[PDB]
Every structure is written in structure tokens, then in C-alpha cells.
Design goal:
This protein has about 60 residues and is mainly α. The chain has two helices and no strands. The protein is rod-shaped and about 55 Å long. The protein starts with a helix and ends with a helix. The chain binds one RNA strand of 86 nucleotides through helix 2. It is found in: Nucleus. This is MPN domain-containing protein. It is classed as splicing. The entry lists the keywords Chlamydomonas spliceosome, C* complex, Cdc5L, RNA splicing, splicing. Cryo-EM structure of the Chlamydomonas C* complex.
Length: about 60
RNA sequence: GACGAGCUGAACGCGAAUAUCUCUUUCGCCUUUUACUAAAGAGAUCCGCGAGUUUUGCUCACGCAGUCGCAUCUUUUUGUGGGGCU
């Protein structure tokens, strides 16, 4: 299901890269605006912490 | 007629951020089950959050103190007095 975090981070990347390189800034490494995708994965992790504690407690 | 920062307790309650899961169905992947899609609903959970005195921990601070058991010219507190008739 974390294909939706991956699709969301891909959309976030398209938007940020488009709005970032406008002008002479161009087309490569160098964009480090990471808080949008960071918070995508933080939401993933908050929601999956209970599921994974269950699964790992069951494994244990 | 009058005074808080930080923690754990409060017991009541969901500005703007939102992820996961379960169930009942439909739809799509399609050999099967997981693992998934996207619709309808019904339910949970997570990560957090606000105010009341409880004080624990100040490292701040106090009591003749800011407050006590409208003030003379025609319209208001400077009144028009005095007498006497049924």
C-alpha cells in the first residue's frame, strides 16, 4: 500500500522540481527541499507503527 | 474591595495537520492466498493536541499596597418665609 507514499513523493518531486528550476537553475542534483517528502514518510510511519508493533509482537 | 514557569498526574473535550488498520459490499488486478486498485458504507487505531487545582520540582516574587466598614446663580444638596378661614 506504500505505493501511495511513493506516488505522492513522485508528485511532490515533480511539483518541487518544476517550481525549483524555474530560471537559470537547471536540471540535476541540487534541489534539497526535503520537508514535503519527509513528512509523507513520517505520516506513513505514524500510521504503520501500530500495525508493525502488532506484527512484530506476534512474531516475537 | 488583590499575584506562574516546567513534569507527572487531572477528568472532562476534537483552529490544522493524517496515516494505518478491521468489517460489510461492489469494482479492477486475476490461477490461488497474501499483498493491492477504487467506489459505497460501517468501525477502530496511531501520532499529537485545550482549560479548569494536584502538586512534585522555582531557579521568581511580594503587603500604610494599587482599592478600604459628583463639593455655592433660573433644573435639582443651600428649598419662600409669615398668617389664617372649614
Amino acid at each position: 500500500r506504500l505505493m501511495r507514499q511513493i506516488r505522492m513523493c513522485k508528485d511532490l518531486k515533480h511539483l518541487i522540481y518544476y517550481r525549483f528550476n524555474t530560471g537559470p537553475v537547471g536540471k540535476g542534483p541540487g534541489v534539497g527541499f526535503w520537508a514535503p517528502m519527509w513528512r509523507v514518510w513520517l505520516f506513513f510511519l505514524r500510521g504503520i507503527v501500530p500495525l508493525l508493533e502488532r506484527w512484530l509482537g506476534n512474531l516475537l
